[model samples]
Structure formats: C-alpha cells, structure tokens
Target chain A: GFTDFDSLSGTSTTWVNELGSVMTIDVDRKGGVTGYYVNNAPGTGCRGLPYDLSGHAHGSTIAFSVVWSNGIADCRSATSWAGYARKTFGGGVQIVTQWSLAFVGKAGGKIETGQNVFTYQA
Target chain B: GPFNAQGFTDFDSLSGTSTTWVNELGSVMTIDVDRKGGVTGYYVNNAPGTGCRGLPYDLSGHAHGSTIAFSVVWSNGIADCRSATSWAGYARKTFGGGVQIVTQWSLAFVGKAGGKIETGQNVFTYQAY
Candidate 1:
C-alpha cells in the first residue's frame, strides 16, 4: 500500500479549482495543515484576499476549512472542504472535494454546496 | 515619459552577491543574481518522500523586476529520482520587514517509466547572511 499522506508537506503545493480559486497548503509531519486560500467566486466579498485555512490530512483523504472573515466587512462566510487526492494516469495529482459554504449576513443564512476538482497547477 | 521612470527598481538590491532562502520543507536555496538578470543557484531538497533528499542540485534562472523563474535538473546520477523542476514567482516585501519569494513550481519525473508531474507552490523567505 502506498501511503503518501505526508507528501503535501512542502510549501509549494497549491490546489486550484476551475473557478480560479486557489488553496496553498503546508502540511506537517503529523498531517496538520496550515495555509491560505483565495476565493474567486463571483460576488464573493473577499475576492483576491488570502483567507485563513486549517485542515488535516490522513492517509489519502484530507479535510480543511477556511474562515472568510479577515476584517473585511462584507465577508462573513465560512467554508469546509473535504476531499481526497488521487494520482491520475498521466502522473498528475487531482483533488476531488465537496464543500459547503455558509453565509452569515444573508436573510436566512444561505448555504451553498458544490463539488470541485482541484488540479495541481502543473 | 521614457516608459515610465518609476518602473521596477528593486532589481539592484536583489542582484550582486549570493543570498540564502529556505522554505518550510527545510529546502535551502542559495541564489546569486547578476546585473543582467542572470541567476545561478543551488537547491538542497530536504522534503520527505523525495528520493534525492539532502542532495544539492544546480539551479539556473533569471530575475526581472520582482519576478524570478528558475529550474533545476536532477541529473546527478541519482538512479531512483531523476527529475527537472521549475519555479516561477515574484519577490515581495514582507509585512514584517523583509523579502520573500512566493513561487509556483512543477517537478517532472523524467527517469521513471510512468512518472508524474508534481506541482505546488513555495514561499522562500530571505535568510540573512
């Protein structure tokens, strides 16, 4: 069995989705993750700003969360993403994640859910 | 107005003499830049799971304005780990008072039959001499 949980230890690993949003993660030896994420979704309050990221990696599965509030008045959203990294046929790493975003200021506290395919920025 | 005289002026400070930079993965890079934007450096890969750990590899690249692009070919007779890595990014002034290079990189494993291209980003902070 190939256990590559610690393969994401380097500071250079960036996971980018189709929406142009990017997550740069640094993993420790114990699978603790710390990094930032730039949310590029349309109508996002905190566009282009790096938000705080926290997560954990175990085996080939990973989960993380981002707090969208970094003193930005309009940004009051929190998101949690859970995914797994798989090596594709062409020697590439792909992360498939399902995320849920919860907005605070919305009338009914709107929540959104989506799946993202984060490809290694090769 | 002569292509705007206020263009990138940080090159002079980054050139001349060698400087050391390191990332969180314990990788160390010693880079020297010339006045003509030419760059020469060496990288020590200390990342876990890499076959060529602790090996020094020659690096060549260029620095223009605040942007830099470099590559390292791991052809030092390392049988299990032969790859070529390239990094491209910008140098920015850190919020606390220093310089850091944030780059995105791709490493292509050339030696293996079904090797893969690994991609990631790195933040190399300046280490004082």
Candidate 2:
C-alpha cells in the first residue's frame, strides 16, 4: 500500500476561507514535503504561510511535524500538521490535511489553525 | 465590452455606486467606475515588507486581450511605497458576473528605499458597481 502523502506529492488544492475568501495550497515532496498556502489578510495572521514536513509513513497514513527547511520563517507554525487520505468528490484518492499550530514568538505567540483537502487528478 | 482600452469599467449599467473584492489573503480591494470609464478608489495588500497600500491617487485602466489592466502610480507612493511602480497592476475581467480582476507586479525600490524585488499576484472577484 502507498502512503497518505504519496498521492499528494507534486499536486495542489483550493478552498475558501472563513470569510469566503478563496485560498490555495501547493505541495511537493522529496526527502520530505514542502507546502505553500495563500490566505487573505496578508498583513495579518491570514498572510501567506509556507510549510516543510518531515516524518514517517505507516500504511495509508503519515504522521509529520512542521519544520523550517529554510532558515527564514515564512509565517508558518513550528509545530503541527497531520495528513490523511480520503476519496474525492469524483471518487478518487486525495489528501485531507489538518494543522493547529501555536507560534510563540515575533508578535507574542498566537495560535494559527487551518484545514485543507488536497485536490488533483489522481 | 465591459472595459475600455485602459481597463476602465466600460459598462454603463451597474447596481451600485462602488464595488469591492477581497484577495486570497482577505485584503480589501475596491473600485468605483463612472459612465465614461473613469475609475477611482484604493487597494491594499495588507502585507509586510512591500506591496502594501495605495491611496489619494488617480486610478486608470487599459485593455489586454481578454483582461483589463488598470494601474495607479504614486509620485510619493503610499505607506512604504516609494516610487511609480508601487501600485501599477490592477486589471479587471470584462465578461464575468460582476467583474474578475487580476494583479501582477514586480516593483523595484526607488530612492532611499530597500529590497531589489517585491512581487505579488492576485485575482479578485468584483461585486459590480
């Protein structure tokens, strides 16, 4: 069996935020995975946040943590990121990701939350 | 034709005095169009570093194939804005429900400013003015 992230590698998804603002996420993988998210309120907490994932896979699930591959922090949490595999609206494999992070620095440690259902031809 | 040669709202019939659109990051982008394709108002990316805000400036437009490429420049720029390229790419869609606008810009720092490039691309959905 392949891993939950296997189908997610080299693909992206789109969703709407709480305020009906459309957002997008792109993901790619090698030794680990890298993700980029575009959210509204760029000057605020809803600004763009990028991710770097490193973890182990088991069966159809993969447990991972967020880390900075690049020295620069691009507004993402240093912790969080859980991924699971699910069927899409068209009956296909896709990754549904959930993350809850508490970034404790910069602007005095605030909690950032997000949910993503990856969509791409698979 | 919903836009003129300069991406101004060329449509004569609309439902409101002004319309607004929000980018992927939830920053408010707005515009007001006149009967003669005259456009006014402001846009803000609400981000840090660069690509922030524009105000008290005249907005105008032109056509680009299926897209309307409107732009605004500041002699004094807005906020951390320092040159003419601060707010230049504001394009609107011509044939959609309201109007779909797109913005793509790569601004260079001018004068005693900083950074070599501050770029961003945004697509906005309009509420139709």
Candidate 3:
C-alpha cells in the first residue's frame, strides 16, 4: 500500500494492472507505489527493473497510464493516467492517453468509463 | 486485491541536471525545411553539404517503428563566433514521406565567439516500450 510517491532522479515505473485479467506489478526508484494484488496472475511482468543509459542519457520524461477495474476500485482508480511532463532539460516523446476506466461497486456506485486508444509506444 | 498506484507528479530543482530529451518534432531530430538557403549543398559555403559535419547535431527517429534518438543543436547565422572552435557532431533523420525529397544536414561551430555558441540543449533515448 505504498504509492507514497516521490522521485529524486529515481527512474522506474510504467504500469497496467487489469485485474479483471492479470496482476503482478512492482516498481520503485523512489517514485513509489510498491504493490497491489488481486487474483494474482502474471503472464508477463515489468514494473520497473530495467535501466541502461550507459552512454548518453539525457533527462526527465517519465509517464504513466493503465487501467482495469471490472469491479471494486478506488484510491485513485486506474485504467488510464496522464503525462506531458517537463522540467529537467525537458524533451519530449511521452503521449499515453486513452484507456480510462472506473466502475466502483458492491452494487455499482461509480461509473466513468470513457477512453480506449490501444496503441503503445514511448 | 488488484490495486496499485504511483504518483510523483514532478519534483527536482536545484540544477537537478537535464539538457534535453522529452519530444515530438518532425518526429525526432534532423530537420531541414527550406533546403539551400534551403540546404544549399550545406550552408552556402563553410559546408552544409548535407548534415553530419558538425554543429550541435544529435539525431534519431522513427519510434513505434523503432529507431528512437534525439539531441540536436541548430545554427544558421553562418560561422563567425570562435576562439578555439569546439567540435561537435551527432546525427539522425529518417521517416518516409510522399517521396521525392532527400536528406539535408547542418552543424558547424567552433570555440571562442562567446566561448563556443551552440546550445539548444539536446538528448533523447528510449526503452520503456
């Protein structure tokens, strides 16, 4: 339950956990958000654990967006997030928008699903 | 039970250190539009001869298609500023259009004019897929 959030130059994070399907995401370089599990399933894994700017690594341009809540969700429900971000030598190439989901319930309480642009590339 | 969230927004200021790389222009470095005055065999004389000679040339492009790169410095005042003439070279520019248009290059700067003037600040990278 750690999405405490903070980055000092700490790069690591990019997620998509549609528990209505699979789960198992972990990332932390300081921009926190340790874990959140459901029926626990992983057919593919990657939540920050790869880095290599060995030579020529410019600066800042980190983004996020992913959602999956066919049921019960809160604490900042996901299925879609946003990032145009700039403030460190500021460059570009971060545009992930579309895949917004939200449907909270015991018997349906929050419903705001409006976004679906399936095409990933950063 | 299926729940994870992360938010830092953006924090870091104190010369946090960052030159460039954040993006979307002609789709990633290496740009020439007029060609002679519009890329005339590369800068009328000193040699614009089609990119990759030197200036602040950082290049890379074609993402999603794979081939991401960025870092570019521009100059068209026609060389004049220099003392020791600092050398610089890095390049890229690839993406097909309707056809019938080729590649043009520009980069040239030496030290001393104001102590080597060339800094649009550049840097680009990829691997987050």
Candidate 4:
C-alpha cells in the first residue's frame, strides 16, 4: 500500500545519543540536508566542537556526513551515518543509524564502525 | 613538471544523446546528457519480481564535473509502487577501461511512508547496447 508519502523538507531534528553527543539536522525541499553536530566524547580530539554535517534525506531515511575538518587543528577524522527515523510507540522519534568513522591522513585511513541510537529531544 | 590530477573533471565526456547503464540487479537506465551536464532519462526496474518491472520512470538531474545527482519519482499514477528515489555521487573511470557511476541512493516508499526506506550503494557501468 505504498502511496503518497510525507516530505522531510523544512523539518529539523535534534538527536541526542547515549553518550550525550548531539546532532542537529535540517532538510531542504530537494532532500538535501545540512546541519552541525557536537561530539561530547572525551579524548576524541574534537570534543565539544561543532563540526559541519552534510547529507540527504528521503522520507524517513537519511544519510549524512561529518567531516571533522572545521578548523579544528587536531581533529582530522570524518564520520558518516545512514539510517531511518521512526516514531516510537510513546510518540517520540528515534533515529537508529550505523556509522563509519575514518581517521584522515592515517595509514590506510584507519576506520571504525558502530551503531548509534538517538532519541528526539523536546 | 608532472601534473597529477586529484579528482575527475571530464564532465563533457559523459555527454551521450542516448546512453544506457546497467546496475548489478539488472535495472536498465537510458539517459541523455548534454554538454551542459543536464540529464534526462528513464529507468526500468528489472529486479526480479519487482512490482515496477518494465515500467518506465522519468529521471532528471545534473552533473557537476564528475559529481552527479538525480532523482526519480515513481508516482506515475500506478497504485502499486509509489515512491521517490534519489542518487548522488560521482563518476570515475574504472581500471578495466570504462566509465562507472557510483552513488548512494535512498528510496522511500510512499505507501509505507515513514515506516519503510531502502538505502544502499549502487554502481552503474556503461552498457554498449
């Protein structure tokens, strides 16, 4: 029963992870996404810095990237997150995503992967 | 002095009045590209047992240098599969000697709305025929 769907354009969502990191996203009419994020984790070298985010959104699915190159002298990494947003039974929105982080300039461009569940904030 | 290129910039080479591309799932796309990077195409979903099989869906997008972004809306008044699909990425020359367009796509089914979404990577290679 796939018919007319909802548009994510002009909608903004702020997602917070368990580690207290925050990601705020804005979707354009063309599904292009732009926003910023703050990584709260310690020793990440870019802690508390607002890195630029870029990606695309379609319906409830989204794919975005954060290049840790926003003038942060010591931060030389990039992360990409791709996932879907769903409404919880309790009427809250949650974004479950799998992400990849790559350390730029490293040998072989060392990488890591993980899943992050972000809950919608009021 | 040797000049080493960093990224692709041969946008004009992608120009084809009528060119076909095929993906791993056998989906066929016939497109037209002008010298200005304007793209207009039609896609036939040949994935086995797909509901939109043999249906031609219109596509429109643009190419900026080696980067390309395009979309297809499956809202052709067909009740079975209504969705919007978009692909954004770049084209690069393959080592084996042909052009390949690599993109990440997000397909959101309208009927399923916020409940269903398909996202993945697709690599389309030029089809001579």
Q: After superposition, how far is residue B67 of candidate 4 from its true place, in Å?
A: 16
Q: After superposition, how far is residue B103 of candidate 1 from its true place, in Å?
A: 0.3
**TM-scores for every predicted model:** 0.47, 0.33, 0.18, 0.52
lDDT of 1 by residue, A4-122 (tens): 54665764588789889998888777555677889898876789988767655544555566645555533544565555566777678876665555443434334455667788775
Sort every candidate by DockQ, greatest first. Answer: 4, 1, 3, 2
Residue-wise lDDT of candidate 1 within B1-129, one digit each (tens)?
121112324434666657788997979998787765556777899989877778776666556554555655553444224345556565566556667776656554433344345556688887765
Tell me candidate 1's interface RMSD: 14.9
User: Taking the tens digit of each residue's C-alpha lDDT, what string does model 3 give over B13-50?
Assistant: 10121122222121232222121111101111123343
**By DockQ, who's the top model here?**
4
Q: Give the Cα error of residue B60 in candidate 3, in Å.
A: 17
Among all candidates shown, the one with the greatest TM-score? 4
- The C-alpha lDDT values of all candidates are 0.62, 0.39, 0.22, 0.62
- Of 1 and 3, the candidate ahead on TM-score is 1
Q: What is the TM-score of chain A in candidate 2?
A: 0.47
Greater-lDDT candidate between 2 and 4: 4
Better of 3 and 4 by DockQ: 4
Q: Every model's DockQ, to 2 decimals? A: 0.03, 0.01, 0.01, 0.08
Q: Which window of ten consecutive residues has the lowest lDDT sum in model 2 chain A?
A: A54-63
Worst 10-residue lDDT window, candidate 1 chain A = A102-111
Q: Write the per-residue lDDT of candidate 2 for residues A29-122, one digit (tens) a residue.
A: 4212233444453454534444333332222333234322223443333333344455555556544444434343554334454554444433
**Runs of candidate 1 exceeding 4 Å displacement:** A1-122, B1-9, B78-80, B110-113
